């Protein structure tokens, strides 16, 4: 059975390498697909810097810090989607935007403890 949180190590991708620049076409779909790719080990993370979001496809799926005081290095996170400037969920600081991973070479791995909600 699925625990409330799962430890994952996500490949961190540079935005210009990403081949599939979002998870879908509605908030509900992107959240659903992100969660599936996270379970399958086929989800990457792009760190948000100036110029990143316009190079990715909306709706966006962010991982945001959900909790403080981070077990074994994995930051606790939850998913929040964004479309047209409106966010679906509320949480803490953004760690990055999730994208499909289809074999791109990462620059780093990001350890997270993901809330499965
Ligand atoms: C497994 C298949 N080649 C696939 C990769 C990425 C996405 Cl987003 C959907 C399907």
Author numbering: 9 to 77, 79 to 126
Lines quoted from the article behind this entry:
Nsp1 is a two-domain protein with a short C-terminal domain, which is involved in the shutdown of host expression by blocking the entry of host mRNA in the ribosome. Therefore, nsp1 is considered as a potential target for antiviral drug discovery. Using sulphur and chlorine anomalous difference Fourier maps, we report the unambiguous identification of the binding orientation of four nsp1-targeting fragment hits.
Whereas the previous three fragment hits can be considered as chemically closely related analogues, 7H2 represents a smaller fragment of 155 Da containing a single central phenyl ring with two distinct substituents binding to a shallower site on nsp1. Due to its quasi-symmetrical structure, a rotation around its long axis does not lead to a new distinct orientation, as the ethan-1-amine substituent contains a rotatable bond.
